[PDB]
Amino acid sequence: VPSLTQKKFLCDRTMWRIPFSSNFMSMGALTDLGQNMLYANSAHALDMT
Amino acid sequence: SKEIPTPYMWSYQPQMGLAAGASQDYSSRMNWLSAGPHMIGRVNGIRATRNQILLEQAALTSTPRSQLNPPNWPAVQVYQENPAPTTVLLPRDAEAEVQMTNSGAQLAGGGRSSFTPRQAYLTLQSSSSQPRSGGIGTLQFVEEFVPSVYFNPFSGAPGLYPDDFIPNYDAVSESVDGYD
Known part of the structure; x- marks a missing residue:
């Protein structure tokens, strides 16, 4: 019989993580792009969808 | 025979870089056996020059050392x-x-830039952190290890011979590390 495939996953038990970084690298407690804003003084908002 | 010897030519080791033990020169000999007196005194007058060129080359070029073929x-x-x-x-x-x-x-793309006027450039050392030891290259073996002209050959005490002419001999063990 002719067929077609389906390709969804499931990854339970953990959390998605987006490290607030330049190259997304966990390089300690701080991040260089994390403490980049103290080099400025911005205090600006965000939107997520 | 003992007086005008055909010189011991070495052999190059490409892996270790040491001398692979020398051998008698057996691939440049004239076939003077079919010659009377007016040429076998001329052929021996030729080998007595390459046993003097190789002694005025061994002084100009080779490094003066005690252990020839050092490990x-x-x-x-x-x-x-x-x-x-x-x-x-x-x-x-x-x-x-x-x-x-x-x-x-x-920013995107990429004096050198228009927003900043300065442009610093650094230099750094390009040599190794330590100099090299343990084994000489090919051109060093071109330079050193000229064919050793060995006069009055094998004419002394054991251990007083050049033991590194044996192409099996460890220079710091007095022994062939053989099959074991």
């Missing part, structure tokens, strides 16, 4: 490689470039 060469007696220090042109000094992005301007 571990020192650092200073081996040709090193010291090129020029690599002058690296840094494109954009980020001490005033990260301030430009934090002002709000995203």
Whole structure:
């Protein structure tokens, strides 16, 4: 019989993580792009969808 | 025979870089056996020149050392490689470039840049951190290890012979590390 495939996953038990970084690298407690804003003084908002 | 010897030519080791034990020169001999007196005194007058050229070459060129065929060469007696220090042109000094992005301007592309007037460039050492020891190259074996002309051959005490002419002999063990 002719067929077609389906390709969804499931990854339970953990959390998605987006490290607030330049190259997304966990390089300690701080991040260089994390403490980049103290080099400025911005205090600006965000939107997520 | 003993007086005008056909010289011991060495053999090059490509892996270790040491001398692979020498051998009698058996591939340049004249076939003087079919010659009367007016040429066998001329042929022996030729070999007596290449046994004198090879002694006025061994003084001009080879490093004066005690152990011919040493197992571990020192650092200073081996040709090193010291090129020029690599002058690296840094494109954009980020001490005033990260301030430009934090002002709000995203950059793209890439004096050298128009927003900053300065451009520093550094140099660094291009040689190795330590000089090299233990084994000489091919061109060093071209330079040193001229064919050793061995007069009055094998004419002394055991141990007083050149034991490194044996192409199996460890120079710091007095022994062939053989099948074990």
